[PDB]
Amino acid sequence: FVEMVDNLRGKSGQGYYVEMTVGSPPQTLNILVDTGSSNFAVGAAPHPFLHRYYQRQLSSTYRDLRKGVYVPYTQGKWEGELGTDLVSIPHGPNVTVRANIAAITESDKFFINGSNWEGILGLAYAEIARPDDSLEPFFDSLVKQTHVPNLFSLQLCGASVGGSMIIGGIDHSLYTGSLWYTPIRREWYYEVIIVRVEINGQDLKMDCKEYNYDKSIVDSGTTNLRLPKKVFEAAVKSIKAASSTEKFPDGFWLGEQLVCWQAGTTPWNIFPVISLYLMGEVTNQSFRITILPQQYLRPVEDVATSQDDCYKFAISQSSTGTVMGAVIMEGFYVVFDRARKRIGFAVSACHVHDEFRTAAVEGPFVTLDMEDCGYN
Amino acid sequence: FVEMVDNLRGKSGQGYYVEMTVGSPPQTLNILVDTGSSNFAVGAAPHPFLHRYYQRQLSSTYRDLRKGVYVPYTQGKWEGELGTDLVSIPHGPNVTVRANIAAITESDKFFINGSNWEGILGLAYAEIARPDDSLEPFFDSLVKQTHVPNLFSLQLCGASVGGSMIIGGIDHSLYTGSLWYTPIRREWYYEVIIVRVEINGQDLKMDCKEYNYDKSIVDSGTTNLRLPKKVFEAAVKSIKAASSTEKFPDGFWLGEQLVCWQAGTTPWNIFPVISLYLMGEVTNQSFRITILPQQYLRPVEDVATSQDDCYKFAISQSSTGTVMGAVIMEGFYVVFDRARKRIGFAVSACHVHDEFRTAAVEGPFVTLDMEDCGYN
Numbered sequence: 001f002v003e004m005v006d007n008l009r010g011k012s013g014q015g016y017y018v019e020m021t022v023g024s025p026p027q028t029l030n031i032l033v034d035t036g037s038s039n040f041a042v043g044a045a046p047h048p049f050l051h052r053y054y055q056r057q058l059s060s061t062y063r064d065l066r067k068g069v070y071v072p073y074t075q076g077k078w079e080g081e082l083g084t085d086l087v088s089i090p091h092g093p094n095v096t097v098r099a100n101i102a103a104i105t106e107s108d109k110f111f112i113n114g115s116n117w118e119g120i121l122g123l124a125y126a127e128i129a130r131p132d133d134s135l136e137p138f139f140d141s142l143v144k145q146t147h148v149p150n151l152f153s154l155q156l157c158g159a160s161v162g163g164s165m166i167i168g169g170i171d172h173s174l175y176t177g178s179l180w181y182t183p184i185r186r187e188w189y190y191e192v193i194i195v196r197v198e199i200n201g202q203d204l205k206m207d208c209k210e211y212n213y214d215k216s217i218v219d220s221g222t223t224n225l226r227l228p229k230k231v232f233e234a235a236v237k238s239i240k241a242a243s244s245t246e247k248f249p250d251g252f253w254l255g256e257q258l259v260c261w262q263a264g265t266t267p268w269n270i271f272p273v274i275s276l277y278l279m280g281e282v283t284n285q286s287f288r289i290t291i292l293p294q295q296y297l298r299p300v301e302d303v304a305t306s307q308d309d310c311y312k313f314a315i316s317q318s319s320t321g322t323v324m325g326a327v328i329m330e331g332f333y334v335v336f337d338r339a340r341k342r343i344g345f346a347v348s349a350c351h352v353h354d355e356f357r358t359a360a361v362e363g364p365f366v367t368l369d370m371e372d373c374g375y376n
Numbered sequence: 377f378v379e380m381v382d383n384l385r386g387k388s389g390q391g392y393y394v395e396m397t398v399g400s401p402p403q404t405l406n407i408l409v410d411t412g413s414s415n416f417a418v419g420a421a422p423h424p425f426l427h428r429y430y431q432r433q434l435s436s437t438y439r440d441l442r443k444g445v446y447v448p449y450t451q452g453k454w455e456g457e458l459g460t461d462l463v464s465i466p467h468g469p470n471v472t473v474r475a476n477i478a479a480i481t482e483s484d485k486f487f488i489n490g491s492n493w494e495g496i497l498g499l500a501y502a503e504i505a506r507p508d509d510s511l512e513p514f515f516d517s518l519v520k521q522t523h524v525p526n527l528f529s530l531q532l533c534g535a536s537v538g539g540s541m542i543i544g545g546i547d548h549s550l551y552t553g554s555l556w557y558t559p560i561r562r563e564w565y566y567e568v569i570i571v572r573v574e575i576n577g578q579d580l581k582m583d584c585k586e587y588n589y590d591k592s593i594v595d596s597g598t599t600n601l602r603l604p605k606k607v608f609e610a611a612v613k614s615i616k617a618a619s620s621t622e623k624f625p626d627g628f629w630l631g632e633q634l635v636c637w638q639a640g641t642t643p644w645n646i647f648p649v650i651s652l653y654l655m656g657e658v659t660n661q662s663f664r665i666t667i668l669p670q671q672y673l674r675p676v677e678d679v680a681t682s683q684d685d686c687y688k689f690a691i692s693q694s695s696t697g698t699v700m701g702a703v704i705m706e707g708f709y710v711v712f713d714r715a716r717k718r719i720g721f722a723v724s725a726c727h728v729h730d731e732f733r734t735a736a737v738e739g740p741f742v743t744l745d746m747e748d749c750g751y752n
């Protein structure tokens with residue numbers, strides 16, 4: 001696994017990507033690692049933002065599936081042509097596989113101008129694969145055609161930024177202390193159940209069933225930690241009041257303006273550590289992950305309307321549930337243990353850390369009626 | 377007002393715009409009519425998607441305000457340089473005014489590739505103007521510097537598509553029957569209070585306070601009718617079950633895949649009319665607006681992965697409240713009566729109508745405790 005270490009580039013703002021090769025002979029592309037979707041879609045036409053794109057004409061091994069896909073988002077969309085071809089991951093396992101590729105032929109607000117990636121690798125499960133759950137995801141093909149074990153792990157770092165995708169197992173050099181595991185509630189998204197939240201050290205006497213309304217998921221393709229309204233509403237109230245040494249703008253919390261200081265002058269300690277307790281592997285047992293304010297206030301880089309230490313509030317609202325984005329994942333080594341229906345967390349050997357507090361994964365804790373926190 | 381009739385172009389998918397002129401001599405630009413924001417922002421650099429952009433260097437009358445703006449959205453952002461200049465609306469009032477312009481110098485996922493507009497005219501109020509409520513919105517400058525009365529009205533049409541912005545008053549040729557008025561609850565967004573909802577004819581025994589959690593607004597710059605989760609959840613359940621002659625995809629309702637038939641074969645009548653009751657002008661009195669399925673199922677045009685009559689579900693979820701978008705507004709002539717803190721609705725003389733049902737604005741109805749439907 002020394003080969004796979006540090007095989008990711010990019011930020012949480014713009015995503016993390018791994019180099020991939022597609023077709024015979026190998027076309028090299030930079031592809032977003034996205035645990036929030038299940039399609040392997042690559043740009044296959046010269047959209048002007050793209051550095052590279054998939055040229056099927058040049059591949060011995062491509063096969064058209066004579067079938068198209070349309071994938072709308074909030075303001076976004078992409079659209080392509082389903083086929084299959086030979087995929088390999090240079091700095092991954094030393095195998096090669098026949099995976100589905102959606103050749104993106106049209107898109108709106110999908111690719112980022114000035115980004116350095118050209119497709120997405122949806123690592124989530126069949127059930128949310130477009131167009132339907134028979135479009136077998138990449139990772140399933142990988143395990144299903146090779147001797148690669150059914151799990152991968154992710155260490156996302158970054159102050160641009162880097163990280164590691166260890167396909168097939170775990171690499172002990174990427175975390176400290178112990179890995180704790182929460183169940184994958186169902187294999188569609190990487191859905192997990194949050195059972196209690198705390199800010200700094202004090203919870204939120206909130207029906208935990210809210211924390212997971214209607215969903216809680218782990219998504220390397222979402223930037224923020226994203227909370228539902230009631231919990232966000234509740235959350236911010238408590239972070240806001242906690243963080244009243246100083247008075248910041250009332251719309252900033254809603255991510256409608258950003259906030260700024262200068263070099264050195266970022267007020268670390270006015271801000272609370274935040275703690276999510278996740279359902280554990282055993283009845284009535286949980287564990288917790290604790291994020292520093294480094295994680296939920298992320299530098300907004302080159303705003304030319306300043307030369308200051310600006311930051312956006314990396315927590316936000318959701319109609320679709322909790323989303324533990326790259327802001328949360330940057331603190332931890334996250335193991336996606338598809339073989340045992342569980343996701344493991346450990347302190348990342350690369351989390352940004354002051355000489356004061358830290359990120360933490362701790363347990364066990366005793367929590368009753370955890371199964372009641374999942375929405376049905 | 378014969379001059380202002382039909383001075384809007386575009387769709388609900390891509391927005392409606394009015395021709396404007398800025399600077400001396402007049403630079404012509406196509407600008408989005410957006411009642412969901414309060415900034416007049418125009419593209420002022422040669423972003424490649426843009427047909428035209430504001431060239432300050434060429435204006436006698438421009439004045440720099442030596443101050444910048446940054447405006448983030450969900451995935452989106454823009455950023456510019458505050459100044460003021462001379463603005464006129466060719467097919468508007470025969471005046472000219474000194475308004476604030478944000479010259480957009482940088483943006484991500486803001487402009488649409490293949491769109492024909494180049495800025496936005498935020499018609500909402502100071503309170504949500506970025507950076508703060510002292511950046512006086514266009515319309516306030518308009519009324520405040522001319523004899524133009526403090527109201528405008530909008531007729532949005534469309535099967536591309538058209539419409540009319542009547543600045544300064546009402547034009548009786550754009551609606552049928554009577555105008556009914558709901559209070560502007562507060563002057564930030566165009567916030568209104570929904571007090572009951574019905575599908576086909578049957579309500580939703582839902583605490584009306586949900587319908588407005590935390591906000592209900594009228595937004596010509598939002599495409600969908602957008603409902604909060606509980607109400608959307610509730611809503612769809614009732615539209616879904618109502619519309620079970622046929623079985624459509626389970627993810628389509630969430631706007632994650634679109635749905636299709638062919639010429640002639642759109643099943644009109646399986647789908648219910650929807651009714652929103654809005655708080656009226658008098659204690660315990662309301663009125664209602666009724667939308668046909670034409671309105672909430674909008675053609676998705678050139679999907680090349682078909683030659684069928686496709687449609688997206690024009691209703692969706694929200695962390696930020698109800699939003700009555702261009703899907704709702706297409707049915708009605710909407711009067712923004714800033715002078716009397718109220719918004720008027722009437723059947724649009726241009727709503728798309730089958731030889732069966734219709735859009736409707738009706739009243740009065742007796743509804744108790746309407747003031748309790750507003751979130752505080």
Ligand SMILES: COc1cccc(-c2cccc([C@]3(C)CC(=O)N(C)C(N)=N3)c2)c1
Pocket residue numbers: 011012013014015016032034035036037073110120219220221222223326
């Ligand atoms: C940190 O990761 C990202 C940063 C910016 C954008 C994206 C991204 C771009 C395009 C599509 C996706 C998507 C496939 C769809 C989506 O909205 N989510 C939340 C997701 N998981 N992946 C992400 C990821």
Ligand SMILES: COc1cccc(-c2cccc([C@]3(C)CC(=O)N(C)C(N)=N3)c2)c1
Pocket residue numbers: 387388389390391392408410411412413449486496595596597598599702
């Ligand atoms: C039908 O109107 C539109 C269709 C597509 C896009 C837009 C649009 C594009 C860019 C910004 C806006 C914005 C300023 C921000 C926003 O998200 N909303 C909801 C809004 N009212 N206007 C709209 C409007």
